[PDB]
Amino acid sequence: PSIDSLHYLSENSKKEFKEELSKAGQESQKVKEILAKAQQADKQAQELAKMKIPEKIPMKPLHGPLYGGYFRTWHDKTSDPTEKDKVNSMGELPKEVDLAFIFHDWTKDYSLFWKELATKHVPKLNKQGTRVIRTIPWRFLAGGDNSGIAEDTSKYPNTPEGNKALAKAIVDEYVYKYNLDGLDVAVLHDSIPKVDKKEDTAGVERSIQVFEEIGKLIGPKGVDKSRLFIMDSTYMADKNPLIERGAPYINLLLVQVYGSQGEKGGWEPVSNRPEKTMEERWQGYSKYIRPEQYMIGFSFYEENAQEGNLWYDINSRKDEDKANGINTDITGTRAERYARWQPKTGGVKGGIFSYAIDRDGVAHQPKKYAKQKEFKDATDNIFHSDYSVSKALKTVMLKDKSYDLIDEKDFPDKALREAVMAQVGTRKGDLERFNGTLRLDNPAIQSLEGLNKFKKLAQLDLIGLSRITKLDRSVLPANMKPGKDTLETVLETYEPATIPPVSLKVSGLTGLKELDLSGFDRETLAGLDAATLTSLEKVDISGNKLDLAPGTENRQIFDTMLSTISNHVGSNEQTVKFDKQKPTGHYPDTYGKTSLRLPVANEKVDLQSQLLFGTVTNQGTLINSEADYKAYQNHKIAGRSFVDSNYHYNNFKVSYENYTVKVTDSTLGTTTDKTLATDKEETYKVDFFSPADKTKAVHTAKVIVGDEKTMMVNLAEGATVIGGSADPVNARKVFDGQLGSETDNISLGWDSKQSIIFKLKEDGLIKHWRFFNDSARNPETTNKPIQEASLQIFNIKDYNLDNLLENPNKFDDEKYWITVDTYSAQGERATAFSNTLNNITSKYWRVVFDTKGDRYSSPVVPELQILGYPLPNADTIMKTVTTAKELSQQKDKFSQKMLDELKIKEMALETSLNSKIFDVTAINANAGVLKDCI
Ligand SMILES: CC(=O)N[C@@H]1[C@@H](O)[C@H](O[C@@H]2O[C@H](CO[C@H]3O[C@H](CO)[C@@H](O)[C@H](O)[C@@H]3O[C@@H]3O[C@H](CO)[C@@H](O[C@@H]4O[C@H](CO)[C@H](O)[C@H](O)[C@H]4O)[C@H](O)[C@H]3NC(C)=O)[C@@H](O)[C@H](O[C@H]3O[C@H](CO)[C@@H](O)[C@H](O)[C@@H]3O[C@@H]3O[C@H](CO)[C@@H](O[C@@H]4O[C@H](CO)[C@H](O)[C@H](O)[C@H]4O)[C@H](O)[C@H]3NC(C)=O)[C@@H]2O)[C@@H](CO)O[C@H]1O
Ligand SMILES: [Ca+2]
Ligand code: NI
């Protein structure tokens, strides 16, 4: 009986039986048993082809806290009847299990477990209410590495039509083949599609398309909605590649959160806080599914588990009790906390599930034996479970008020009750947690009794409710006023949240007579369409944080309601109330003081108080002083003010201490003192910074003491290094505009004196220069300071620039350069040095620094700055100046009269090059006149 002629065995099972052939390939007596079993395996395989899948028992739709479980096929006593220690059966799962997940592995194709499942387990579990679900890995929807059916790439190509063929083939193979109740797709890192044992991106993308086609067949958006379409994952929502396009097609999301990591989250010591927490996890998924579809999972103790697969989600065997492999108490377990857990927002959860439910009741191997790979504990044997833990957990949830149905004692009005259920949910627990939008626009609503049940409602739209006549605290959500979360957590951890007060939109309540919003600390009235509240007779908005100044939207909503009430019953101290306001002072988005001009005097200004100031309400009223706020307290409505008599300018004002400052003079010198001295004529740029950010400024201003000067630029930034002893990679960092961090080595080179040869970016007129000592970057730096330095330009009159450019290193001698300024440290602590330069024009430069330290003395220069203004053709213009001066001495060639006119023009040009306001257009005009006169 060859194995190639068996017909009914799957090619996989045949690939197995022929490998077992190779072993003992010629042993006379073992070549028998392998064929004799490959046959008996074929007899079984053909009994699976001819079994009769029972007719589907119709089942009640899902409802209430659900409890699922993953039964490991290889622990069913029919998986491999030769292993007589496997005693459990999936059919024995009690009615408390709403979802029994077939979790497949190690059970042979030809196993008769599949005939016990189809013809006995499904009928039994179905008659009691338990749905049976097949679990398949992510990779079954794409790729070819263990992709099961999808390995056949010709029958199911990766195309629009191929993906449909694969989706229908999946549902047909794994759902309908045994008349199962639904399909579960597990997306983890372990199940991700691979090829060559490499994560396949083209494979992951195909799986999204195939997942969508499967959803067009089963699940809430498929042709057959009786079958469930479930997804179980370990990814956070922001890392699940299939939730965005997949979520609308699934009935339930099962997040696997085993162990204290799933519950508490992971620690991240850079934040000093936890991440991937239980609350953070669902908040991510709350964008894609309703909370009633969310199900959190734990794990029972799997036999012979090793490091990485030990979760301790159920109680552990006591170290003394060495014979007791069993523990069925839920008290103090992670699973029992998971059953009672409810998110803080949205609503209550679908339920919980357990992995390896065939191990229900088995205690956990003590933590101390985790690393002993071969230690066989009492809890590592196989037991028959009566599923006591599963029953105990299910009843815990089933007996939780959170899942009590919303009834007429919450909302006596039917029209309101039907709308709450349409938009919020159907559980009392959903009122304590729903943080979305409730739109009550059906005018049949006769009463708003019950709305006070809402604790976290984000927005409430009351539209066209003609039968409503009163609105006050008793018939509005409880979060109308600020408050903190009151739902206590049942989980473990290592402050409560703020409840954003509700946004109240009201429009078309023509029957509304009284509006009482007092004592809620409301920030605005936005949402009130006062032009529609036509029957309003009594209004009270006192004791809030409203800015009722004229011109505001708040005042106009108020004026409108006051006008309506003034045609119905009259405005008076009883029908209209508004006082006791405490508007919230905010920082402005912008500030108006963009320039401050002072005379040159020996005074002192506080830059903060003179440029950055002012508090603004959320209505846009700017208060810039204690004087404006008294004009504000002076605003009167019906003869009296609306600001609380106890709310002073000190309370309303926003504080500007902690705000830093970055002053920059016209030579690009920098300070950081709020105090400035007007003793020196100079022009400064001032940037202010909030404590929360020191890179994006909140306000820029321009202080001008005396005659305004144009601000210089760092013409050296971006300069090209072409020489110098100094390390060219590091050299170029002196032109990089920032000082740097003290992690980066910026040492120029080995010996104690180092040059840098460089060319400026664009032409320019240079008027200043500055080099920073190392103390500018880190004040505690151990790199000694520069003792002596020289800045030089290239002797272009005598030497050829082209010779320099062809062999720039040859020219590292001061004979080829001209010195324009030398620095010599006198021995005093200096963070930087700066000095003027005489309208230099050269494009090519050479600097040297010297710490004077015999050896091991490294020149460290954060940044070298050659400052000035941009000026195209500085060469020619400055060349023209020096010509008129020469001519003016040749008093024999030119008459005195010719020279006096030329002198005025040469003088005029020099004046424009050294003017405080640099004007390139005037310069060119003068230098053009001068060259023309020559
Ligand atoms: C998705 C999900 O549910 N989330 C995770 C769980 O996945 C996770 O549970 C584990 O699941 C393992 C099985 O998962 C596989 O199936 C699911 C569903 O189809 C897939 O989603 C998943 O990716 C796994 O896929 C399977 O992978 C294998 C390996 O590749 C495929 O077959 C092999 O594939 C390779 C290529 O990679 C190659 O081609 C090979 O030839 C091929 O055989 C397989 O095809 C693929 N699925 C299919 C059908 O497509 C469980 O195994 C795991 O449980 C084992 O380990 C725990 C450790 O604590 C034990 O407690 C537990 O009892 C079990 O032990 C194993 O028992 C069998 C029973 O006999 C032992 O077999 C023996 O092995 C011997 C050699 O060691 C001899 O060969 C002997 O003849 C043989 O009988 C086996 O050795 C035991 N192994 C161990 C480790 O003890 C676990 O339940 C859980 C984990 O916490 O978390 C969930 O959230
Ligand atoms: Ca630098
Ligand atoms: Ni062990």
Author numbering: 48 to 541, 548 to 987
The authors write:
EndoSD233A/E235L crystallized in the P21 space group, with one molecule in the asymmetric unit and diffracted to a maximum resolution of 2.9 Å. The EndoS glycosidase domain adopts a (β/α)8-barrel topology with a long cavity that runs parallel to the protein surface in which one molecule of the G2 glycan product is unambiguously identified in the crystal structure. The reducing end of the core Manβ1–4GlcNAc disaccharide is located at the end of the long cavity flanked by loops 4, 5, 6, and 7, and several residues from the β-barrel core. W153 is positioned in such a way as to engage the entire G2 trimannose core including the central Man (−2), the α(1–6)-linked Man (−3) and the α(1–3)-linked Man (−7). The terminal GlcNAc (−4 and −8) and Gal (−5 and −9) residues of each arm adopt two alternative conformations into the crystal structure. The structural comparison between the full-length EndoSD233A/E235L-G2 and the truncated unliganded version ΔN-3HB-EndoS suggests an important contribution of the N-3HB domain to stabilize the GH domain and generate a completely competent glycan binding site.
Endoglycosidase S (EndoS) secreted from Streptococcus pyogenes is a 108 kDa enzyme that specifically catalyzes the hydrolysis of the β-1,4 linkage between the first two N-acetylglucosamine residues of the complex-type N-linked glycan located on N297 of the Fc region of IgG antibodies. The presence of this N-linked glycan is critical for IgG function, contributing both to Fc γ receptor binding and activation of the complement pathway.
